[PDB]
Amino acid sequence: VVTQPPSVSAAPGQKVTISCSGSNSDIGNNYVSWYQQLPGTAPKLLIYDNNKRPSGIPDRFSGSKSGTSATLAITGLQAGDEADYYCGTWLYDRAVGLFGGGTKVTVLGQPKAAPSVTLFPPSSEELQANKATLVCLISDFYPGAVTVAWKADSSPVKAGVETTTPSKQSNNKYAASSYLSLTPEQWKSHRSYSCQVTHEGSTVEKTVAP
Amino acid sequence: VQLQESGAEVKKPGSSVRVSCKASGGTFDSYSIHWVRQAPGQGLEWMGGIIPAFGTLSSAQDFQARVTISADKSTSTAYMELSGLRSEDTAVYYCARGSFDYYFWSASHPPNDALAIWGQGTLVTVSSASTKGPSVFPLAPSSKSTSGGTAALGCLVKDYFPEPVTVSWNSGALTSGVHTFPAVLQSSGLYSLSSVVTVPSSSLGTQTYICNVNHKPSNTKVDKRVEP
Numbered sequence: 001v002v003t004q005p006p007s008v009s010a011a012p013g014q015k016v017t018i019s020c021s022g023s024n025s026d027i028g029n030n031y032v033s034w035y036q037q038l039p040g041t042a043p044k045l046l047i048y049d050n051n052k053r054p055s056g057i058p059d060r061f062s063g064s065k066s067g068t069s070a071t072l073a074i075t076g077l078q079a080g081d082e083a084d085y086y087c088g089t090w091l092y093d094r095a096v097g098l099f100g101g102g103t104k105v106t107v108l109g110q111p112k113a114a115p116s117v118t119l120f121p122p123s124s125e126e127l128q129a130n131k132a133t134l135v136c137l138i139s140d141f142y143p144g145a146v147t148v149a150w151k152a153d154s155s156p157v158k159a160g161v162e163t164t165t166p167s168k169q170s171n172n173k174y175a176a177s178s179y180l181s182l183t184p185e186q187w188k189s190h191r192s193y194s195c196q197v198t199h200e201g202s203t204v205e206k207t208v209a210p
Numbered sequence: 211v212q213l214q215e216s217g218a219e220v221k222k223p224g225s226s227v228r229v230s231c232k233a234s235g236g237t238f239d240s241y242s243i244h245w246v247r248q249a250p251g252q253g254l255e256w257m258g259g260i261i262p263a264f265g266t267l268s269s270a271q272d273f274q275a276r277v278t279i280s281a282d283k284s285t286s287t288a289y290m291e292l293s294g295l296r297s298e299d300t301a302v303y304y305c306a307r308g309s310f311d312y313y314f315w316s317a318s319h320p321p322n323d324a325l326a327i328w329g330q331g332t333l334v335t336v337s338s339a340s341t342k343g344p345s346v347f348p349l350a351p352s353s354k355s356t357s358g359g360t361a362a363l364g365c366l367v368k369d370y371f372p373e374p375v376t377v378s379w380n381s382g383a384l385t386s387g388v389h390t391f392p393a394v395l396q397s398s399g400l401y402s403l404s405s406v407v408t409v410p411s412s413s414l415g416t417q418t419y420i421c422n423v424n425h426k427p428s429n430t431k432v433d434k435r436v437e438p
């Protein structure tokens with residue numbers, strides 16, 4: 001196994017360094033290449049031939065090798081560099097490929113962001129199939145942690161609630177969604193339903209009525 | 211220029227999968243083709259490689275007896291078949307094309323080959339749970355979804371298995387303000403997700419909005435009209 005540090009962090013504009021630790025049979029005797037994987041994207045070639053760069057790759061990314069150990073370096077660390085980075089080798093003798101564990105790059109000092117909340121009531125077409133779903137969509141929040149509580153009128157509803165884990169968006173902000181499953185009867189029985197989203201001690205609440 | 215992979219699928223434990231890798235806007239020529247897998251939330255794992263021009267292949271020790279790596283010269287399609295599938299074989303299967311032209315290769319000189327071009331990946335889900343197409347419901351814009359100015363409208367993609375589901379709007383012409391949210395997994399074992407689009411409030415009576423929901427494991431496409 002080729003070892004990489006699991007996490008690496010620095011503020012915007014400074015230098016970060018990703019290590020790739022191996023042995024003589026893997027990194028030692030062969031060429032190391034570097035790969036970038038943004039969340040939800042396929043990996044992308046950053047560095048080939050220990051230090052060379054393909055067309056389109058900015059000069060802020062550089063590579064180095066010293067025996068059994070290789071290193072990727074990022075200078076002028078931007079917001080758009082927040083990704084997963086892998087070192088990869090080809091064992092020429094054995095004809096086998098090997099990737100390091102991967103390193104997550106987190107950019108420090110990102111500003112706090114209040115969540116944007118949209119709540120949708122059941123569609124009449126969904127109600128006609130004798131089922132109801134309330135859709136609470138949460139986006140553009142930072143840090144990536146929210147608490148969701150649902151209410152029927154003003155009473156707490158715990159049953160029939162499914163919330164996702166927060167997910168990272170393309171703008172380095174986070175998103176999550178919560179769903180409240182009801183019967184058309186329960187939906188009509190109450191005068192309103194609320195989705196309450198708490199983040200950094202402050203709550204953003206949305207309401208829907210039949 | 212691109213590597214077009216076969217669609218996502220559920221596969222029963224003990225069964226075998228064959229993932230296709232079709233080159234579009236370019237042919238295999240004398241470049242290498244590699245299969246790399248990624249289990250959800252995990253690292254990249256090299257499985258095997260082939261130089262289609264030679265028919266010469268190799269596979270990782272951990273896959274040697276279960277992987278069959280092949281390639282068709284003309285057409286330019288490469289295949290990876292993995293047998294005795296297990297729950298731990300659930301992963302996104304990528305195919306990638308090397309930068310080096312092996313016509314110029316001298317075996318006494320290792321080449322500076324690297325994974326230059328990648329496919330989008332096909333998520334193979336190994337499960338004994340059977341496939342289910344989604345139920346798509348419109349999420350109508352109202353005064354409770356309006357912010358000026360702009361207005362949020364969407365689609366609800368309910369009860370599907372397995373992942374993934376892709377959503378585009380207006381056949382790909384509407385890309386600005388589109389936010390497709392990651393799916394929730396219900397206790398039923400079925401997933402649901404939502405796709406929203408933030409549009410100008412003034413165009414709600416004049417512009418047609420259709421979300422295009424793709425569920426490749428069930429070969430379903432729902433083009434759902436979102437009206438006010």
Ligand SMILES: CCCSc1nc(N[C@@H]2C[C@H]2c2ccc(F)c(F)c2)c2nnn([C@@H]3C[C@H](OCCO)[C@@H](O)[C@H]3O)c2n1
Binds near residue numbers: 244
């Ligand atoms: C038999 C396997 C053919 S595929 C192949 N690929 C080579 N380079 C791989 C792309 C680069 C790579 C980099 C980083 C990674 F993480 C990764 F997974 C892959 C490659 N380089 N040399 N060779 C020779 C050719 C020869 O096979 C042909 C005759 O049998 C064999 O000696 C390989 O070691 C490569 N083959």
